Amino acid sequence: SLRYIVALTGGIGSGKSTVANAFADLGINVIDADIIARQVVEPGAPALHAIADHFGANMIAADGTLQRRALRERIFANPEEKNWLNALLHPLIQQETQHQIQQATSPYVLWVVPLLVENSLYKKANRVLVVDVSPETQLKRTMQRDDVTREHVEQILAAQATREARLAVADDVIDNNGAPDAIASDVARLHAHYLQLASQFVSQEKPE
Numbered sequence: 001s002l003r004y005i006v007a008l009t010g011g012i013g014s015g016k017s018t019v020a021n022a023f024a025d026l027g028i029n030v031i032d033a034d035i036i037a038r039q040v041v042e043p044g045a046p047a048l049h050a051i052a053d054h055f056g057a058n059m060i061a062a063d064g065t066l067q068r069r070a071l072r073e074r075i076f077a078n079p080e081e082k083n084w085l086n087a088l089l090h091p092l093i094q095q096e097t098q099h100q101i102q103q104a105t106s107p108y109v110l111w112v113v114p115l116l117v118e119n120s121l122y123k124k125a126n127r128v129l130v131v132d133v134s135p136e137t138q139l140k141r142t143m144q145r146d147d148v149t150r151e152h153v154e155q156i157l158a159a160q161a162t163r164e165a166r167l168a169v170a171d172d173v174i175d176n177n178g179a180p181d182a183i184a185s186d187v188a189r190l191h192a193h194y195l196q197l198a199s200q201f202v203s204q205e206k207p208e
């Protein structure tokens, strides 16, 4: 069957997981790109044999599991390897993402993709939701969470797509500048629309 996909994105410290949990509370299955990336290298996964062949047998632990810290460290000391690893994992991530979307039974699925704009992944979504906050909020919340400097978070902000680049591809925008609670009402309104879009998209003769 065809699943209706709502992608969710936002920059660092915007509240992507916070908003995703509110949809999950309403019964929506959430597919998270970062969890999918960890799953393709789990014990017994196909990518593990390729990784051992490329980086060395010692990239694998005693029980057959990936020495994740050792891999992260090896790629940081060999920049070209980062690209080699992403190229190997990409198709596997695409397949696993599709598998999880097909396996979700909620009316529509919420696909949380931090790199949605950077990687042009909005092309694979039926609807795009952006959780938006000011840059100051991004900085303050990340600083509090990780106990890091303003400068450290600014560097991440400058590496990510801009706020305006995310807004330019959004169908809907949810504000998360307020406190942890205006989110429920806004999520409920969006959810009610998503249920309608999902119930009608397969037969919808004309565009919106």
Ligand SMILES: Nc1ncnc2c1ncn2[C@@H]1O[C@H](COP(=O)(O)OP(=O)(O)OP(=O)(O)OC[C@H]2O[C@@H](n3cnc4c(N)ncnc43)[C@H](O)[C@@H]2O)[C@@H](O)[C@H]1O
Pocket: 010, 011, 012, 013, 014, 015, 016, 017, 018, 019, 114, 141, 142, 145, 146, 156, 176, 177, 178, 179, 180, 181
């Ligand atoms: N590119 C990158 N480079 C380096 N580190 C990166 C990184 N991307 C992520 N991290 C690392 O992952 C953590 C969460 O990611 P994220 O900030 O992109 O996560 P989101 O899913 O957008 O956000 P949440 O985890 O939902 O919320 C983040 C923080 O804000 C708080 N928060 C959320 N809504 C709030 C609200 N309404 N009022 C006050 N605080 C709120 C949360 O408790 C949490 O401390 C970062 O702090 C950093 O450690």
